[PDB]
């Protein structure tokens, strides 16, 4: 198991534009197209991203290419962020993966606002941080996924995904 398999499980794969759990237009492996309510706007964003006239449908290969870019962007977003980097650097590989999952879903923004959890994480107070992360809109909205990620963080193992 790794970050790619892990997120492909959390996000699934859809080749037609769809609405995510917040009702935003998405496609592929969790790639958000836009926060606007226009499907047109979504279709245009999809075309600009793939570089062709898609008409709201992409291939598997195109999905994967987006996903690759997006995982990459999540990692670099972390490394570039001054509060996150040192947290991420302090951890082992499994837990880093939990962190990337969070950033991928919620954006650099959303995740940097878990300050308190980040401190605990940096101190390696796993059970505590686990309790803290669950007091969040994130856990309340997408609880099954949130649990998977939080277990990973807590245990440092891939059990929740096996």
61 is catalytic: no
Q: Based on CB atoms, which residue is closest to Cl ion, 65 or 96? A: 65
Q: Cβ 58 to Cl ion, closest distance in Å?
A: 12
Q: Is 93 exposed, middle or buried (0-12, 13-18, 19+ CB in 10 A)?
A: exposed
Cα angle 55, 103, 7; round to 5: 65
Q: Based on CB atoms, which residue is closest to Cl ion, 48 or 162? A: 48
DSSP string, 136-157: SHHHHHSHHHHHHHHHHHHHSS
20 is catalytic: yes
Distance (Å, whole) CA 91 – CA 86: 9
Is residue 104 part of an annotated ligand binding site? yes
**Binding-site ranges for Cl ion (CB under 5 A):** 49, 142, 144-145
Instruction: Pick the catalytic residue from 20, 47, 108, 128.
Output: 20
Q: Based on CB atoms, which residue is closest to Cl ion, 53 or 144? A: 144
Q: Which residues are catalytic?
A: 11, 20
């Amino acid at each position: 198991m790794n970050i790619f398999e892990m997120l492909r499980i959390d996000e699934g794969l859809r080749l037609k534009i769809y609405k995510d759990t917040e009702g935003y237009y998405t496609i592929g492996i969790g790639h958000l197209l836009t926060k606007s309510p226009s499907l047109n706007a979504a279709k245009s964003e999809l075309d600009k991203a793939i570089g062709r006239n898609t008409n709201g449908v992409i291939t598997k290969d195109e999905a994967e290419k987006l996903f690759n870019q997006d995982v990459d962007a999540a990692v670099r977003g972390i490394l570039r962020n001054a509060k996150m980097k040192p947290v991420y650097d302090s951890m082992d590989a499994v837990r880093r993966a939990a962190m990337i999952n969070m950033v991928f879903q919620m954006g650099e923004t959303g995740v940097a606002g878990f300050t308190n959890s980040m401190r605990m994480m940096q101190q390696k107070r796993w059970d505590e941080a686990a309790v803290n992360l669950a007091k969040s809109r994130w856990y309340n909205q997408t609880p099954n996924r949130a649990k998977r990620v939080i277990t990973t963080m807590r245990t440092g193992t891939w059990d929740a995904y096996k």
